[PDB]
Design a protein around this ligand. Structure first.
Ligand SMILES: Cn1c(=O)ccc2cc([N+](=O)[O-])c(Br)cc21
Length: 123
């Protein structure tokens, strides 16, 4: 149907916007601490601590499968990256501190993304 095509066009446009957002967020992680899943080889007990691991590569895979239906779903995954890190690592670590900085600098990007998704009507 034409309605289904229209819905699919909206999803494609949301995906385009979210791709730009993801690139901007990842730029705020220059050390690439959050680029890939936490290695169970360097951190073998990780899954005993963290029940829903997340990272930028995993988000990008979901994104390109058009697996984010709205901005909220995308933000949920971004918040997992930060929140997982601030639980597993102590405040005096380069990991925790990278998550704080990513959260802070990311908030700015996400604030304007919410305005764009709303005003253009992408969900
Ligand atoms: C425990 N842990 C986190 O919580 C978040 C990121 C992270 C990255 C690496 N890394 O190598 O990039 C390692 Br070993 C551990 C990490």
């Amino acid at each position: 149907s034409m309605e289904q095509v229209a819905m699919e066009l909206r999803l494609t446009e949301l995906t385009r916007l979210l791709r730009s957002v993801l690139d901007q967020l990842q730029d705020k992680d220059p050390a690439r601490i959050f680029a890939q899943p936490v290695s169970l080889k360097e951190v073998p007990d990780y899954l005993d601590h963290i029940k829903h691991p997340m990272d930028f590569a995993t988000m990008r895979k979901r994104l390109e499968a058009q697996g984010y239906k709205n901005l909220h779903e995308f933000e949920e995954d971004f918040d997992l990256i930060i929140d997982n890190c601030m639980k597993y690592n102590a405040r005096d670590t380069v990991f925790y501190r990278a998550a704080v900085r990513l959260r802070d600098q990311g908030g700015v990007v996400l604030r304007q993304a919410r305005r764009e998704v709303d005003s253009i009507g992408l969900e």
